[PDB]
């Protein structure tokens, strides 16, 4: 119950400190399988760091082991994706999966154009909103705690309230008016609906890639994927 005692600034720094590192892809001009191969390998290594990041999200520890598993199982692709769009901001028109893996619309396999375009549109939204890193780590943790909270609990809602406070505490101090504060709050949270949508779309394709059995999934990814069915 220590997360609730934290100040707003104490909340920010704790989240910034918990940030997972940026990983690299392998060091050829790309085909359908090999591209999904690289992303799959990348995603698997990132998951290990995401879990250690999750432990350091204030309030996540207080949950039972089973509730930790649930939230992570529901939200893992969302968390990866919002990560992807965040570091893709300074690269308009492209997605930076890794510092050595920068992609553009030119080919993607099939039906990847829509998810590519959706991801690219989110990044541009972050760009024109001038999303700050402090705001970003708040959004990401919100995703972690919210996406599974509707059984698919009072403590979690209390912690969610806390992270809300932090956001407003960040917009105030940024010189924003009271009206600009709740307006920016709304704008930020509405994008989370789109991020949920992209996850869902992306998930169904990983389920499809599995049935194709050309891009091999790691046992951990298999479990995370299975939990969505």
């Amino acid at each position: 119950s220590l997360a609730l005692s934290l100040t707003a600034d104490q909340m920010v720094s704790a989240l910034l400190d918990a940030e997972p590192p940026i990983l690299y892809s392998e060091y050829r001009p790309f085909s359908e399988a090999s591209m999904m191969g690289l992303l799959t390998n990348l995603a698997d290594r990132e998951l290990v760091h995401m879990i250690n990041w999750a432990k350091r999200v204030p309030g996540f520890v207080d949950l039972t082991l089973h509730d930790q598993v649930h939230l992570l199982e529901c939200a893992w692709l969302e968390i990866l994706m919002i990560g992807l769009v965040w570091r893709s901001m300074e690269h308009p028109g492209k997605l930076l999966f890794a510092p050595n893996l920068l992609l553009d619309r030119n080919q993607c396999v099939e039906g990847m154009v829509e998810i590519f375009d959706m991801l690219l549109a989110t990044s541009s939204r972050f760009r024109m909103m001038n999303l700050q890193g402090e705001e970003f780590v708040c959004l990401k943790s919100i995703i972690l705690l919210n996406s599974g909270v509707y059984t698919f609990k009072d403590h979690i809602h209390r912690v969610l309230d806390k992270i809300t406070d932090t956001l407003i505490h960040l917009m105030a101090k940024a010189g924003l008016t009271l009206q600009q504060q709740h307006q920016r709050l709304a704008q930020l949270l509405l994008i989370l609906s789109h991020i949920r949508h992209m996850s869902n779309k992306g998930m169904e394709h990983l389920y499809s890639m599995k049935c194709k059995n050309v891009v091999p999934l790691s046992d951990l990814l298999l479990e995370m994927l299975d939990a969505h069915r």
Binding site: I51, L65, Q68, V69, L72, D219, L220, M224
Partner: peptide, 9 residues
Amino acid sequence: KILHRLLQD
């Protein structure tokens, strides 16, 4: 399952 172990280690 794997996830459990990672959340304990």
